[PDB]
């Protein structure tokens, strides 16, 4: 499923992401845009045998278990398949753990590179939330 911008903004708001760990809703919408282009089925293979899964590109070495990644820690205690669902819930609940790790949203490279320090509110503007 490829979300629309405002569709995803409303979903993320319902999931309690607005101001989660201090990050306003726009940060999360922007992160999803640059991480996955709003695509819930996005995947990216990495050189360590891990894969990044889903709308927020959560990694299989540290966060979810895909059964094929060396050194798997599975800190979110979830199968990576659950992160490819059309509903965002499993991704969001894992993202809540990730953003709580100690370095905020810096865990998401695409967010650091294209969202951090920008006018992130633009991503929810017009959405009638």
């Amino acid at each position, epitope marked *: 499923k490829v979300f629309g911008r405002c569709e995803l903004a409303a979903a993320m708001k319902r999931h309690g992401l607005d101001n989660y760990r201090g990050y306003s809703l726009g940060n999360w919408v922007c992160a999803a845009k640059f991480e996955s282009n709003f695509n819930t089925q996005a995947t990216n293979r*990495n050189t*360590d045998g891990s894969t990044d899964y889903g709308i927020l590109q959560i*990694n299989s*070495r*540290w966060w979810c278990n895909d059964g094929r990644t060396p*050194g798997s*820690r599975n*800190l979110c205690n979830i199968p990576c398949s659950a992160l490819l669902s059309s509903d965002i819930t499993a991704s969001v609940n894992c993202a809540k753990k990730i953003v709580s*790790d*100690g*370095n*905020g949203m*810096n*865990a*998401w*490279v695409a967010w*650091r590179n294209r969202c951090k320090g920008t006018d992130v509110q633009a991503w929810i503007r017009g959405c009638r939330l």
Partner: nanobody
Amino acid sequence: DVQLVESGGGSVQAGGSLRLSCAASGSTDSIEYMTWFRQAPGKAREGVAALYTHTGNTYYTDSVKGRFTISQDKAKNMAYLRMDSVKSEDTAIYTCGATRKAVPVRFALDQSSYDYWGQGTQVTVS
């Protein structure tokens, strides 16, 4: 790929100070942590001090807390280890490590979390 190069090191008197430097080059944009490890004679490598480059947050092994300070110059892709108040037990080969993955803090002092390594530099406390 990322190249790491250490400078500094050598002899120091107990109670004294030494500064180590680590310069990163190559695919430096994706660097997440720069971290100092060490390996004392006859012992396994251990993480000493980790720095998360996008916030400046730092993580230390218990045996060095308060004595060693890791810092960076992010714009120049540098990490520094200031070793103050050195002890006998600090004699070791010190190695810079880096990674381009967003490693959870709890695993930031584990060597298996790191992808790139310097050459090692000897520090000897007399």
